[PDB]
Design a protein around this ligand. Sequence first.
Ligand SMILES: CCCCCCCCCCCCCCCCCC(=O)OC[C@H](COP(=O)([O-])OCC[N+](C)(C)C)OC(=O)CCCCCCCCCCCCCCCCC
Ligand SMILES: CCCCCCCCCCCCCCCCCC(=O)OC[C@H](COP(=O)(O)OCCN)OC(=O)CCCCCCCCCCCCCCCCC
Ligand SMILES: CCCCCCCCCCCCCCCCCC(=O)OC[C@H](COP(=O)(O)OCCN)OC(=O)CCCCCCCCCCCCCCCCC
Ligand code: SF4
Ligand code: SF4
Ligand code: SF4
Lengths: 176, 156, 43, 115, 185, 318
Amino acid sequence: TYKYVNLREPSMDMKSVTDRAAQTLLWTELIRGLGMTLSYLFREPATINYPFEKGPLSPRFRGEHALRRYPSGEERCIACKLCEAVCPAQAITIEAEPRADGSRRTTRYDIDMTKCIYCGFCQEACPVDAIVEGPNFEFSTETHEELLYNKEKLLNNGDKWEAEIAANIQADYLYR
Amino acid sequence: SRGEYVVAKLDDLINWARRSSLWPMTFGLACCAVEMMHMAAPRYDMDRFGVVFRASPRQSDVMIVAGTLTNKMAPALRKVYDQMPEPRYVVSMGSCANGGGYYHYSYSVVRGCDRIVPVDIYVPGCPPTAEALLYGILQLQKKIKREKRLRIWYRR
Amino acid sequence: VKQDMPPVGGYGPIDYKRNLPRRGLSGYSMFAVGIGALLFGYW
Amino acid sequence: MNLMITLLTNFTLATLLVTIAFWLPQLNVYSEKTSPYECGFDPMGSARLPFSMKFFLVAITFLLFDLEIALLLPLPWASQTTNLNTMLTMALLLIFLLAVSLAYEWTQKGLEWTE
Amino acid sequence: VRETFPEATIIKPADIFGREDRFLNYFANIRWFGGVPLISLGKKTVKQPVYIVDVTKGIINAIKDPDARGKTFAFVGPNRYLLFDLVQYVFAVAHRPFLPYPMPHFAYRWIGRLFEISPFEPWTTRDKVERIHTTDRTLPHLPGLEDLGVQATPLELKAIEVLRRHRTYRWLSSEIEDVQPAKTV
Amino acid sequence: MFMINVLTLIIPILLAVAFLTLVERKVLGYMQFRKGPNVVGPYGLLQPIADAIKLFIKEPLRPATSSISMFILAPILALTLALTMWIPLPMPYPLINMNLGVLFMLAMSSLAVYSILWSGWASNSKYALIGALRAVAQTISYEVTLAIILLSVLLMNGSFTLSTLIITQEQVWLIFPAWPLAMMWFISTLAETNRAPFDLTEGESELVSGFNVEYAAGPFALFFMAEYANIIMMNIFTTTLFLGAFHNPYMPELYTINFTIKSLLLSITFLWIRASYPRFRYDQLMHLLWKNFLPLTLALCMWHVSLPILLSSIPPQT
Ligand SMILES: CCCCCCCCCCCCCCCCCC(=O)OC[C@H](COP(=O)([O-])OCC[N+](C)(C)C)OC(=O)CCCCCCCCCCCCCCCCC
Ligand SMILES: CCCCCCCCCCCCCCCCCC(=O)OC[C@H](COP(=O)(O)OCCN)OC(=O)CCCCCCCCCCCCCCCCC
Ligand SMILES: CCCCCCCCCCCCCCCCCC(=O)OC[C@H](COP(=O)(O)OCCN)OC(=O)CCCCCCCCCCCCCCCCC
Ligand code: SF4
Ligand code: SF4
Ligand code: SF4
């Protein structure tokens, strides 16, 4: 259940003593390290040519947030505030009121992207699959206030990436 | 005429020479430092783009704030930023350096590194992926390309 | 049901022990090569 | 004459690059940029304090062995003599005395660093 | 401005000294070129410089005060110095050798002409020369920093903060009080 | 037409210094499973130009607590010492034929240390003083063994003239009768040039940037090209010492191309050594050249004094 690492006593034989003297004087293991590095020179380097190549990803990937809609135009969120209550970083602020046709919808849905820890609890606490964490990750901005998303930005992200989030949810939803 | 052409060419030359020779300093604090050195791994290899680490602040160009900036760390970060010679650039990594992230309401966490240093590029994520950090570096390069310093000097 | 599973016979063998080639010649061969080069250069 | 021309050419090549590295770019010099660098924190004392050295004996014997090898460099010309046996004996004796000094330092723990 | 905006507040500072100023830094950088030339030894002109933070506080209070609309303030420092002992105090703070020498007015203008041909920012010019050797006028009829609730801070408490970066390594850690203060009028 | 000769010597060596920085970055990429700079130009041929232009438009940054005279003087001395290092090197005709060229390299090797020492001392820093004293210890470690190795090798040449070193090995290579001296010479020049595994001065791990931890751009570039010119000429010195090529007085370009290929292969092996081994301690190096190299070198010096007397093979001094 255990092994004695580094308890190997040397051998006192004169032939092996001369071999160790030759290794000492002529630097055998140093040339061994040189040869290993030389063999490592002649391999294919693992550099992918970004931005013309992208690293592999999975359909469960957690990137930029988005708000989805039903396949008729109606938005999926119903202002149930489960995402803002399960959010570990308190990055979600929701204010709601009934709209002109008496449907329970939001008037304010803000996600602070600089507080969000990108753990994906909101996309799994949503009972209607409204909020999703899409596959977008190249969305760095030049200003702090550009990373404070309101409802219009989230709806624009949903309309921008629906063609991908629908396919990813279709590929993944049998595991959830 | 000719002077505007000359200063535009000189601006293009110095912008290319500055954006193709970004030397970031070895500075990390937390998870996001591990992701930054994963960006420096052979898969992505930022050394292709002329981006090579230089440990001293005097020989660096861009400072990458990757990690959580606590109250005990803020004077050190500010001092190291001040010792960096002009021109200098700042890239914010992760939610901790952006707005505090998980620890925004913490008693000993500075809510965003923009309260201490002037930040050019904000890279969001927790951690932002190595591709995301490479995207932020390329965005900073494209921002450097759009500088009109000698044009502004000639016009003023 | 459908799930991720190992195959019926299990996966193949996976090595976990040290495997160093222990290459090179004997010390006497290296010393003989060095002495031969020395004497040829001297002559 | 050519050596002084070469040395002057090298010197005014070297001092041309420094002089164009001090006046060309835009400067923003404050009373924080030029502070000593101590890994982000204020230093605790001056940098002119006595920085104690442990290898003093090796430095003194470096002086003595540098002079021993300074005595030893006329050997290629001294091999062109007629009294060859005496030259060979004195060269061997000088080198043997050098080795004796080194061995006496080795056996007396002089090469080992203090503390 | 007064004729086109009848409710405009006009603020007239005397001379600002601060960390990134061009008043004390100019005097502390003139030492490169020689021995600080002046006009008539710099003992015919009187200056009363004002701290930058006090000017900022006066501006903020003039923004907040409803009675500052239409006024014309005059922001001046609490003490008046001649130019000669002002430059002497600047060099004594910087612990630099102070060897003044006179220069005629026509000779100084030609010097300012030579410096102002640079395509970059000129080190000095004839206008800077004439403003350096111009006595600061007194306007008792105009309200000052005391009418806006700002207490004027003298040059002796901020000159070291301004000019500590101009010292060598030998005199970098000298304290507040080991400099003889300037003589007023 | 001597100034044209001087210019055509001093410009290509710094051009090759910049392209050695390129090649070193590419090889140091390619051994560690990745690539070098290949984005700026066609296979990254414009990276040294971009680095050089960048370093000369950045802030100079002379410290306040530093003595400015020695602070400016040290990089000038470093670059000038690296530039006058190359003068008596025969490729196959040196710029300045000298009776005693080897001692000139030794004296200028002694002088070039002082740039590192004064740049460490002038910049008022503790890390800079640490790097300076490490350079002092490194020099007192290597210098004796370097001088005595070169003495015991030149005894078969007959004189200190470097051009005679071409003639003295036109039959067989000098690496054959002095192969142990060749290995210890290679290790000693690895230690001389402050390259891995004997860096110990510009350590980015034990220190932050060594003696130039306060040097901003421009002045720092002087140390960079000084060090790279040093490593190129030291490989060239080794190539002349032990790997002399065939020289035709009618066609010197044959010797030039043979010598250039050999020195390039030596520099490739130098960067190969750089990316293979951990860095030594700065006292383990002192116990290396003194306890292991010096006794064997004294024995080899006895052997190479007695051997020309032994075989009646005393070389001519003319
Ligand atoms: C330029 C041409 C090629 C040059 C050759 C080198 C190229 C390849 C370089 C490989 C990588 C080297 C990286 C740096 C390594 C630094 C460490 C190092 O080398 O330390 C030295 C090491 C040190 O060994 P060490 O560090 O293990 O020391 C142990 C010390 N104790 C025991 C106290 C703990 O080896 C030597 O010092 C040996 C020097 C060379 C000896 C040559 C002997 C020649 C044969 C003599 C005769 C033998 C036969 C018997 C007698 C017969 C008599 C007739
Ligand atoms: C009065 C008349 C003269 C007026 C003064 C001006 C004289 C000329 C000044 C130098 C040249 C100015 C033009 C610089 C390039 C302008 C075009 C440009 O920016 O091209 C961009 C392109 C790279 O595009 P990028 O966006 O990086 O793409 C990412 C990769 N997919 O870039 C490229 O593909 C490569 C760009 C190479 C730039 C030129 C080569 C380097 C500079 C050489 C000259 C200066 C240095 C000389 C030696 C100094 C000492 C070493
Ligand atoms: C403040 C800091 C310092 C700032 C200033 C720095 C200046 C440069 C410093 C680096 C250079 C130092 C040079 C020191 C002397 C070197 C002598 C030398 O190189 O001699 C080589 C050579 C020997 O000639 P030989 O082998 O006899 O063959 C000729 C026979 N036909 O000789 C010849 O071939 C002879 C050529 C003419 C020799 C003229 C006499 C020497 C001139 C010395 C000038 C002053 C050097 C000052 C160095 C200061 C160093 C701190
Ligand atoms: S991913 Fe997590 S931290 Fe981000 S908004 Fe959703 S629940 Fe909050
Ligand atoms: S959990 Fe879903 S339905 Fe409920 S408030 Fe959040 S996004 Fe809307
Ligand atoms: S932003 Fe997230 S990954 Fe980065 S340091 Fe903070 S907790 Fe770690």
